[PDB]
Amino acid sequence: TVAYIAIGSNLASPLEQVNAALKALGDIPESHILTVSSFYRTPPLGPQDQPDYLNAAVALETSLAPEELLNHTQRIELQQGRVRKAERWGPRTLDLDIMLFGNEVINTERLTVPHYDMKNRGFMLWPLFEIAPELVFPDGEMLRQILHTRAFDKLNKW
Numbered sequence: 537t538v539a540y541i542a543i544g545s546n547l548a549s550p551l552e553q554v555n556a557a558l559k560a561l562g563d564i565p566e567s568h569i570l571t572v573s574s575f576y577r578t579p580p581l582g583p584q585d586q587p588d589y590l591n592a593a594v595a596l597e598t599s600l601a602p603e604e605l606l607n608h609t610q611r612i613e614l615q616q617g618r619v620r621k622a623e624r625w626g627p628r629t630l631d632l633d634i635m636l637f638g639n640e641v642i643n644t645e646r647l648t649v650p651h652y653d654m655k656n657r658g659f660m661l662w663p664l665f666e667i668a669p670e671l672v673f674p675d676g677e678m679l680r681q682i683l684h685t686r687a688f689d690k691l692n693k694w
């Protein structure tokens with residue numbers, strides 16, 4: 537199954553974390569990275585907060601069940617990032633979000649797939665569009681269309 541995972545890091549120098557996360561993702565059992573988008577520097581979704589994020593999208597081939605994949609992404613979040621105390625927006629330094637899991641729709645207490653807000657987030661959509669420009673969401677929405685319509689600022693590469 538191809539899962540699309542968004543990586544966000546709000547570290548000032550996120551490359552090493554992102555690389556650790558990518559390695560970690562590549563190490564998830566039953567999985568392997570198909571493609572990694574470029575790394576993009578994106579303005580934080582919250583206030584300015586300050587920290588730009590590095591955002592990237594990863595296409596991960598996996599035979600894992602989505603909740604099993606989520607276990608691994610959450611593990612990697614815990615292992616490779618930490619919590620920003622008191623931060624309401626982006627408390628984690630490293631977010632790994634399953635954006636899409638194959639063509640599955642998942643609406644469980646643990647997991648909302650497609651990612652519950654990705655259609656509002658250029659920082660998720662543009663990297664994904666880089667690696668999956670033709671992507672069609674389970675409901676038939678098209679990634680390209682969402683971008684076309686919402687006119688999300690293009691992202692600068694990190």
Ligand SMILES: Nc1nc2ncc(COP(=O)(O)OP(=O)(O)O)nc2c(=O)[nH]1
Pocket residue numbers: 543544545578579580581582588589590591624625626627628631653659
């Ligand atoms: N530019 C940018 N801004 C961001 N703001 C918040 C989060 C994650 O915020 P969080 O409080 O964890 O909430 P959620 O992941 O549920 O949207 N991620 C980004 C990101 O990846 N890129």
